[PDB]
Amino acid sequence: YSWKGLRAAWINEAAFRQEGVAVLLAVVIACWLDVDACTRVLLISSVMLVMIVELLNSAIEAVVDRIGSEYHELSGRAKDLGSAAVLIAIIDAVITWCILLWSH
Amino acid sequence: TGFTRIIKAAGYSWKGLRAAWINEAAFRQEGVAVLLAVVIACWLDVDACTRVLLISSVMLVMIVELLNSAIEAVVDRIGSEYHELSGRAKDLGSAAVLIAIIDAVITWCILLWSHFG
Amino acid sequence: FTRIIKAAGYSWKGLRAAWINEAAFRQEGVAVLLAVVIACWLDVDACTRVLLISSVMLVMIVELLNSAIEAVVDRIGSEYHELSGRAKDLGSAAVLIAIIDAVITWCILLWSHF
Numbered sequence: 001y002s003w004k005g006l007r008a009a010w011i012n013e014a015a016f017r018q019e020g021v022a023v024l025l026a027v028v029i030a031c032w033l034d035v036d037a038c039t040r041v042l043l044i045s046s047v048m049l050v051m052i053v054e055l056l057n058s059a060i061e062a063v064v065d066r067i068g069s070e071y072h073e074l075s076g077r078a079k080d081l082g083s084a085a086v087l088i089a090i091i092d093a094v095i096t097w098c099i100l101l102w103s104h
Numbered sequence: 105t106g107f108t109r110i111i112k113a114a115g116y117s118w119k120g121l122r123a124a125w126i127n128e129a130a131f132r133q134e135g136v137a138v139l140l141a142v143v144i145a146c147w148l149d150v151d152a153c154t155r156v157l158l159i160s161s162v163m164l165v166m167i168v169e170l171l172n173s174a175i176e177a178v179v180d181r182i183g184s185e186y187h188e189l190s191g192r193a194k195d196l197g198s199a200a201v202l203i204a205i206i207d208a209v210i211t212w213c214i215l216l217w218s219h220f221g
Numbered sequence: 222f223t224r225i226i227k228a229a230g231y232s233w234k235g236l237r238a239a240w241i242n243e244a245a246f247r248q249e250g251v252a253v254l255l256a257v258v259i260a261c262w263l264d265v266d267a268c269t270r271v272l273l274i275s276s277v278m279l280v281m282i283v284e285l286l287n288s289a290i291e292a293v294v295d296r297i298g299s300e301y302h303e304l305s306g307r308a309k310d311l312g313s314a315a316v317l318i319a320i321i322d323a324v325i326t327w328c329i330l331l332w333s334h335f
């Protein structure tokens with residue numbers, strides 16, 4: 001269950017690949033710069049959160065497709081809603097870094 | 105076509121935000137509360153760590169609520185095919201949102217009560 | 222206040238159902254209680270105390286959403302006879318990242334604290 005999903009998300013969508021490399025990249029940047037623990041955590045928790053949400057949205061997209069092939073207005077709403085949840089996570093993480101980084 | 109997809113899903117997301125605000129009423133109310141909290145945190149005299157924690161905590165609520173709205177949208181969709189509905193998934197979704205708000209409340213209280221006397 | 226009690230009730234019904242049905246959620250429940258007690262016990266600043274709790278809270282949030290997704294699939298697969306756990310896999314991956322995030326948070330904070 002755990003690892004099975006992580007791989008499929010990495011093989012299929014760049015939206016997870018781009019954030020995936022970002023997560024690794026963010027951790028490196030956080031550890032290199034001399035900041036306090038709270039700042040170190042907030043920078044990686046933000047980027048990892050986007051990955052967390054992206055995985056959940058990817059689960060939503062998977063269910064919608066399994067049910068039917070009809071272009072229904074409710075199922076289409078679901079994939080859009082989940083897509084918005086990731087957007088906020090991206091926005092939140094971007095806002096997070098900018099606020100914290102502006103010191104440096 | 106990677107550059108093209110950047111605006112593709114941007115359209116989906118923006119359409120999702122519109123869809124949430126119009127249909128979901130709980131998203132409307134929390135958004136009011138959240139947007140207020142964000143502005144307050146943006147004008148509060150606090151450190152960057154405190155400022156982020158104040159904004160992120162209420163932002164998560166919006167993120168969770170959106171996922172709950174997506175989940176409910178699937179249950180409501182499936183409700184077309186099958187007559188009976190436990191509502192067990194929707195209850196879990198509501199639970200998740202609750203914990204988010206609880207977290208946001210606890211985060212704010214702890215951060216303020218320390219920052220303040 | 223007309224409908225907000227109903228919403229909260231739904232949230233309670235879900236929490237109680239998750240506590241009984243899923244024993245993994247039971248483990249995460251104590252983890253939050255632990256995090257709260259540990260953070261309040263140890264002499265730490267507000268920002269650190271929040272991050273310790275918020276991490277474990279985040280896991281619990283994701284687990285509830287994951288359990289909600291699984292509850293959807295378990296309704297579908299029961300009647301469709303179609304059994305492809307693409308959703309339960311991605312859903313479980315999302316929880317794992319929450320776990321990892323909590324561990325790193327607890328590591329990074331406590332390592333700089335001591």
Ligand SMILES: CCCCCCCC/C=C\CCCCCCCC(=O)OC[C@H](O)CO
Binds near residue numbers: 015026046057094097
């Ligand atoms: C350094 C701090 C800021 C960066 C780190 C935090 C943000 C996540 C990383 C990259 C954003 C670009 C990659 C994602 C591109 C869009 C993905 C997308 O739209 O995915 C479809 C849908 O929105 C969901 O399923």
